[PDB]
Design a protein around this ligand. Structure first.
Ligand SMILES: Nc1ncnc2c1ncn2[C@@H]1O[C@H](COP(=O)(O)OP(=O)(O)O)[C@@H](O)[C@H]1O
Ligand SMILES: [Mg+2]
Lengths: 577, 470, 41, 40, 128, 385, 159
């Protein structure tokens, strides 16, 4: 335990003497004790960057080095919790100090008082390796597995029987004297090890037809969305959290403004998990930071969230991680870089911004955990450039490493088109690798139908000049048919109502059926147009109403409705002749 | 009374003192010179060898042989009281109204603590400013930060004074029917001149609005550290009142551009490398610490609302100051030089203005059930009229349809009657009445964004409103 | 329009380069003053 | 109704004199209380 | 309407300020009558002891020549030099070892420092 | 020290139509005149010194050419002070610190000038103070800080430049002197941004303090259209407070005429965007008339000759008469346009030459000339109809 | 260079219009060249020879292959000679400074060697005063018949 005294104070910078032996990036207590970080060593001198305000400190006050870098506590008790950027539970902070966050307060991330039902799964004399399972704890209906720390080896000497214990209890003691508790600590800036990293050949089902079909993301992939005002980004994120494949949802705020963070904090406790009746928060972890909180917390929030997600997938689950605004995190990084008097690279940002963004985004993926089980982390980070320009360096750096890009647009939201993803600007890079899974699990001709729908949308979009110039009535029959088919697609397949009881979720089978119905109607209408039938007659057909109501059909009732509509489609054309 | 005389260096605004390790960092000190005059200062850096003090005023007359330094307070604090209402201060809490000092109920550090994110709640209720362009189209909700973007020659001070002496809450519209919670206005002016000072004093005295207001006035020739400290003291008083006496507080910061310039000067004086465009690299954090002190709190009936005012340097919205201010707050109100030159006051341009919390502050339990639809219909109609007015210049009026002529006349009348309200105080009902009278100029079925029931309930009124209030 | 865009980005890059040079000079002079006050003993 | 300030002036004078007379009662007690803390 | 309320409020504030200033002046005059009381040497010795203890390593002590004899005995036990000063009334000042630091312990300075804190106590004692 | 600071009520009459009408400055106010080299700051300041109605003029040549000082010294004794009729130099104090004089004395010269102005104010006079350039003062401060090895703030200037400028500019105002009398100091300061860039820190700092801002334009100076003041980028904050004085001493409806002129200029500026897009001939008749009236306003009212024996000085009533004539002509022209008269016919009307030449009429002939021109304008359309 | 040579060759006062007396005073030319190339110097020398003006011309030549620091002194020596002639022997001097850009380059080099606080584009902050101490030496003096006229030549970088 390295102890020293203060030599010089200048703003957030503190110079401590007598600190020989203190390591480079350890966490230190400054003063009576404010939490700081060592950033430089010189002889007996250590430079400490204090997280909080240093006003009122005096020369000679003690400085203590904890001897460990920034880290998080991984164990039972994180679900249904709200944390700041450095894993400080805000609920207990409020219970202690009230509405303000007084400086120098100390609380533990995991509650030391609650008792958990231990269930051993190991026997004395058994060899253990990092990542193996030692026991089991229930948590809100989940089966929490107690895992050996990644860098711990040995054989079991004794194991405690089943009962009630706190997280501080040394449940398993190795023969070399090492005691294993229900939790361990891991540095936030080191990636947790894996056995192997697998290929992206399975999809991450979002529940939204447009995202699932046109711009899919692979299980363990990455995606990015903009944040324009009025585009309904928050409801899209909530629906994604509700209807995903992920067992656990991790949400990071990283420096959002106060009122938006308040809305986020007061909306999730109201959501209901579709797979049960309980609240959605029972399998969710929240990390919230406002713009007036310390900059170091805002910078470390992203890493804390991704480390928690990595731990949860190390348990063997699938985790969805959402970053609320990476632009604010980049702003905090820029400010920290400016504090060190570093040379700016371009538009004020440090030259290593892309390296940090890559180091964050590359932790995601589907892996084989050290315990031999399979897990995955999927990251959907939002980027909100000030002014809406995509040439801003953060957006350019993000778009070079993400696998997909879902361009939210306010123009679509202005005309009540939701979820309001612009299909012209969006793209995805996982379709080619995901095609075999689509063939094996949905339908053999699914990629062909998807390509046909995309081509129809492209052709409909290519005619926007003529229709805007002269009007729709002045077009030919084929062009008018293309326009009307595009309208049918937009109003029946891409559009989705999140608040509806049955329309909120749509499997791949229902989307495939709707696409097949639309394509069949398009081909029948083209044949009828070739046989001299008028487009105005075609637009009056009753089967269009049946097609439009397809998306409000229950999942189990869908196939019969699909068969009936497919029969009606060919009936409406051939029988009339 | 500990005293220090080991001064070994004086240059610019900085002076060094030896054997002063008893001074806490950031303390406030007063420097006494040979003639007996006392001037203040603040500790910038303290070490074993010497401490660095930045002097508030100029360093004329100081010498290394006679001057001495004494401690005043370890941490800058302000003595607040419930009787500060009706008083004027100079930015460091010193009365300048000619009245005796207040007795402090307590003393609080001006660098307040951050609010707990789990202790906030959703802003829900609105404030009536008496300006129809703001109340109807850019509604101000309690707990919001809605800045005003101004120009160089535009009359932002007049708008600030009018809002200060007209703003009020409307409890009877929410069904309460009781004026239980008082309303107070905290006015902070940074880097103003003598003319603006006299104007503000006259405006707050002539209408009796001083009886419910606290004024922190910092002139342009005052020390820049006072300019730094003024908003923090104003917000400390506002938070104290709101969260210890259940007040509804509206805070107005007169010029944030002066604050940013003073911050840049202070940062340069301490030998710090600037950031983008020569501004301090931590300017975003400082602005956030100022702005994020407003809001509403779960379990409390008080509220804090901020209306920052800033002049865009070159009428450029990409300048760091407006860029960060808009990146922190929840919208903006934009002043227009074209409207100002055309003789329209207040010159507020509705098209680039935006309020991001308006939807929460309007509805059926508050204001009126047709508020939002009327607002967006007015927005679309005005945009269409402005677009048509540009084409009528070249293609002539007779080549236009009848609906385009209707839109042109509507735009002209909207500018002439809605925005140009002068020094009048319009309630929300009067503003909605004028809005419906203007919308009645359009055809019955042209109001495409409004539901049928509201149209049948309010359409058809004629223009007899601005003539009744000369 | 594309020509005006090119002019705008050219001027932006010139101004950013000048700002970077000025920051380099400021760092130089700060290092020199610190070195002077240190080595003067 | 333009001479309505006379009532307020009389009220203000009355309340000022009432405050002065109320405070004059414990003048010596207040002096002693503060002088107790002033002395070492 | 509001003018009358503002006028009555400012009249009340002026009355409160005047009575507080009267209390301040009375206390200031009372502290000037202290040296004639028999306990003056005792209290000045206590003040000098406090000032010296607050400044470790003090090399000198300065006071009024009239107050000089009372502290002569205390000078011997503390082992510090003493010197005369006509200006230093109602208080005693201790000079640090290097002479750069000074500690002034005078009744007027103590009153000025403590009046800010004691104003609330005086007000709540006067008006209940 | 003084007793009290008073509100601005009376205007500072510079004798220039554009400044005295569109962008007035009150007695005790502050104004700034930035602009690139060759724009005409020096001529404007000399005209202000020659024709303004201050009792005492203090001219401070902080770092400018010595030929300006020699011009003042040679010319002023031959001119007459408008108030008392004596020689012009008998009311002038001249502080000179030329370009090649020692650099460190520029700040001293500025302070000496302002202190002398304050003293003459304390005697109860109305004093006008004119600093030839504060940018030279800023450059001197930058040089001294470079010698001191300080840390520059922006473009090399010391951090306290803004504070020094504010302290200098805040001594202006109308006061009650310690002797019970009333006096004022008016400060007009010139700025010389490097390269004509108004984003320069000195100009930005000055922009936040002064109550009036008279920006000069290079394009107008190239055309030799003087005083070459950019109307788009100029403003004045004293306009509202001076309305009662204008109503009392100039005319009852003078502010309405000023507002009408400003609105016409605003409409012309708005139409210029379309004109530069499609050409002036694509507009309708009303827009063409607005463009022509704006051109007439620019070339017949705002324009002024500093070297003419009559056009050099213009009283408020003369400007009021000229703008009244212009507005009457515009109203008659639009009425004629509504009746189908071609725009080219209106431009050839002979009264336009009379309106254009009205600026050269002396102050004694003008009252009759105005009536004759008004009757001619009425006849040219109403009697012609 | 051609314009400067033509002005020097053709310049003359017109006493007949002004009625100042048919004094007909020829101009004396002081020619200072800073960092001048051989081509320009050869052109100027040949022009002055052809016009027969070298009999009343003082030349200070600093060629482009000459040391760069000497340019700090050349204009000052030239103007000292011009002032002496004009205000001590009643000559009418015309001063031509070939290129002030090279003078500014030398000034910037000296300032950067001393690490002065620069102005815009690296030039020293005292460059305004430095140039003013050179330009302001021309004019006419009361009570004397001499005169100094300056025609500096400078090339704007990138126009
Ligand atoms: N109001 C004016 N009337 C006539 N000529 C003018 C006027 N203003 C400027 N000029 C001309 O333009 C020149 C501008 O020079 P000067 O006033 O010294 O400019 P600056 O102050 O920018 O250095 C004058 O010498 C004169 O020839
Ligand atoms: Mg000039």
């Amino acid at each position: 335990m390295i102890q020293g005294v203060i030599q010089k104070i200048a703003g957030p910078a503190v110079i401590a003497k007598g600190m020989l032996g203190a390591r480079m990036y350890d966490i230190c207590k400054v003063g009576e004790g404010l939490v700081g970080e060592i950033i430089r060593l010189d002889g007996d001198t250590a430079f400490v960057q204090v997280y909080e305000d240093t006003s009122g400190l005096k020369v000679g006050e003690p400085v203590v080095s904890t001897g460990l870098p920034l880290a998080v506590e991984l164990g039972p008790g994180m679900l249904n919790g709200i944390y700041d950027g450095i894993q400080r539970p805000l609920e207990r902070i409020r219970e202690k100090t009230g509405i303000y966050i007084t400086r120098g307060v100390v609380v533990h991330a995991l509650d030391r008082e609650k008792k958990w039902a231990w269930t051993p799964m190991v026997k004395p004399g058994d060899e253990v390796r990092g990542g193996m399972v030692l026991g089991t704890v229930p948590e809100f209906g989940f089966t929490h597995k107690i895992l050996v720390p990644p860098d711990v080896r040995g054989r079991v000497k004794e194991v405690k029987p089943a009962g009630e214990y706190t997280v501080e209890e040394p449940v398993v003691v190795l023969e070399d004297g090492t005691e294993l508790k229900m939790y361990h600590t891991w540095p936030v800036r080191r990636a947790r090890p894996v056995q192997r990293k697998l290929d992206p050949n399975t999809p991450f089902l979002t529940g939204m037809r447009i995202l699932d079909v046109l711009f899919p993301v692979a299980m363990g992939g990455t995606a990015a969305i903009p944040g324009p005002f009025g585009a309904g980004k928050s409801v899209t994120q909530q629906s994604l959290a509700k209807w995903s494949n992920a067992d656990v949802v991790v949400y990071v705020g990283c420096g959002e403004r106060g009122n938006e963070m308040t809305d986020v904090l007061v909306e999730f406790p109201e959501l209901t998990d579709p797979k049960t009746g309980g609240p959605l928060m029972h399998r969710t972890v929240l990390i919230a930071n406002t713009s007036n909180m310390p900059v170091a917390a805002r910078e470390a929030s992203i890493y804390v969230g991704v480390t928690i997600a990595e731990y949860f997938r190390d348990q063997g689950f699938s985790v969805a991680l959402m970053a609320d605004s990476t632009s604010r995190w980049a702003e905090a990084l820029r400010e920290i870089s400016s504090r060190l008097e570093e040379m700016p690279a371009e538009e004020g940002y440090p030259p290593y911004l892309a390296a940090r963004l890559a180091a964050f985004y590359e932790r995601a993926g589907k892996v084989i955990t050290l315990g031999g089980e399979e897990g995955a982390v999927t990251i959907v980070g939002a980027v909100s450039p000030p002014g809406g320009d995509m040439s801003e360096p953060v957006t350019q750096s993000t778009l070079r490493i993400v696998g997909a890009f879902w361009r939210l647009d306010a123009s679509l939201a202005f005309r009540r088109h939701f979820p309001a993803i612009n299909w012209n600007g969006s793209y995805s890079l996982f379709t080619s690798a995901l095609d075999p899974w689509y063939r094996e699990n949905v339908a053999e001709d699914y990629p062909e139908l998807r390509d046909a729908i995309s081509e129809l949308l492209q052709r409909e979009a290519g005619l926007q000049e003529i229709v805007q110039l002269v009007g729709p009535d002045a077009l030919q029959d084929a062009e008018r048919l293309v326009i009307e088919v595009g309208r049918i697609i937009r109003e029946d397949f891409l559009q989705q109502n999140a608040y509806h009881e049955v329309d909120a979720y749509c499997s791949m089978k229902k989307a495939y059926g709707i696409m097949k119905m639309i394509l069949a109607f398009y081909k029948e209408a083209e044949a009828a147009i070739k046989r001299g039938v008028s487009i105005d007659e075609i637009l009056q057909l009753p089967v269009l109403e049946r097609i439009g109501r397809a998306r409000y059909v229950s999942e189990e009732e869908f196939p019969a409705y699909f068969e009936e509509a497919m029969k009606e489609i060919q009936g409406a054309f051939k029988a009339l002749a | 009374k500990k005293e220090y005389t080991g001064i070994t260096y004086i240059s610019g605004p900085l002076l060094f003192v030896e054997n002063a390790k008893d001074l806490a960092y950031g303390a406030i000190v007063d420097i006494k010179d040979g003639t007996g005059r006392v001037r203040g200062g603040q500790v910038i850096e303290v070490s074993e060898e010497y401490a660095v003090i930045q002097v508030f005023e100029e360093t004329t007359g100081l010498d290394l042989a006679t001057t001495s330094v004494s401690l005043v307070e370890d941490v800058a604090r302000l003595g607040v009281s419930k009787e500060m209402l009706g008083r004027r201060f100079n930015g460091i809490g010193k009365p300048i109204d000619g009245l005796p000092p207040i007795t402090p109920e307590k003393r609080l550090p001006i660098t307040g603590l951050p609010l707990n994110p789990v202790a906030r709640r959703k802003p829900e209720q609105f404030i009536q400013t008496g300006i129809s362009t703001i109340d109807v189209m850019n509604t101000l909700v309690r707990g919001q930060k809605l800045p005003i973007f101004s120009g160089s020659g535009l009359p932002a001070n007049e708008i600030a004074a009018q809002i200060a002496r007209q703003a009020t809450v409307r409890p009877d519209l929410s069904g309460e029917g009781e004026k239980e919670e008082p309303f107070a206005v905290v006015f902070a002016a940074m880097g103003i001149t003598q003319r603006e000072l006299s104007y503000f004093i006259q405006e707050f005295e002539r209408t009796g609005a001083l009886s419910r207001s606290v004024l922190f006035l910092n002139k342009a020739d005052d020390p820049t550290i006072e300019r730094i400290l003024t908003p923090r003291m104003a917000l400390t008083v506002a938070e104290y009142l709101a969260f210890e006496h259940d007040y509804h507080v509206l805070v107005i910061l007169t010029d944030m551009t002066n604050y940013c310039e003073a911050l840049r000067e202070i940062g340069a004086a301490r030998e710090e490398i600037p950031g983008r465009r020569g501004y301090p690299g931590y300017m975003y954090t400082d602005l956030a610490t100022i702005y994020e002190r407003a809001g509403v709190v779960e379990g409390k009936k008080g509220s804090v609302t901020q209306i920052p005012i800033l002049s865009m340097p070159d009428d450029d919205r990409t300048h760091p100051i407006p860029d960060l201010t808009g990146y922190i707050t929840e919208g903006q109100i934009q002043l227009s030089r074209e409207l100002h030159r055309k003789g329209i006051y207040p010159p507020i341009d509705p098209l680039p203005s935006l309020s991001r919390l308006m939807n929460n502050g309007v509805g059926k339990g508050k204001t009126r059930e047709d508020h939002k639809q009327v607002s967006d219909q007015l927005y679309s109609a005005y945009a269409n009229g402005v677009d048509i007015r540009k084409l009528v210049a070249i293609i002539g009026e007779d080549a236009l349809t009848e609906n385009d002529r209707r839109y042109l006349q509507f735009a002209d009348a909207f500018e002439r009657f809605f925005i140009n309200q002068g020094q009048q105080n319009r309630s929300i009902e009067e503003s909605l009445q004028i809005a419906w009278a203007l919308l009645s100029m359009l055809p019955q079925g042209e109001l495409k964004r409004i539901s049928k029931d509201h149209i049948g309930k309010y359409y058809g009124q004629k223009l007899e409103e601005i003539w009744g209030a000369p | 329009i594309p020509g005006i865009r090119a002019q705008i980005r050219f001027i932006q890059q010139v101004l950013e380069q000048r700002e970077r040079e000025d920051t380099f000079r400021l760092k130089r002079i700060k290092g020199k003053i610190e070195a002077r006050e240190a080595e003067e003993e | 109704t333009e001479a309505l300030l006379a009532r307020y002036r009389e009220r203000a004078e009355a309340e000022a004199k009432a405050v002065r007379e109320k405070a004059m009662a414990r003048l010596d007690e207040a002096v002693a209380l503060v002088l107790k803390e002033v002395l070492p | 309407e509001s003018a009358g309320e503002l006028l009555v409020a400012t009249a009340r504030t002026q009355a409160r300020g005047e009575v507080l200033e009267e209390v301040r002046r009375r206390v200031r005059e009372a502290l000037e009558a202290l040296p004639q009381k028999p306990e003056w040497p005792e209290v000045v010795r206590k003040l000098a002891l406090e000032a010296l203890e607050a400044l470790p390593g003090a090399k000198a002590l300065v006071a009024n020549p009239e107050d000089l004899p009372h502290l002569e005995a205390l000078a011997r036990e503390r082992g510090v030099e003493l010197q005369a000063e006509p200006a230093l009334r109602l208080g005693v000042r201790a000079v640090g070892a290097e002479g750069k630091t000074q500690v002034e312990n005078s009744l007027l300075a103590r009153l000025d420092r403590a009046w800010d804190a004691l104003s609330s106590k005086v007000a709540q004692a006067l008006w209940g």
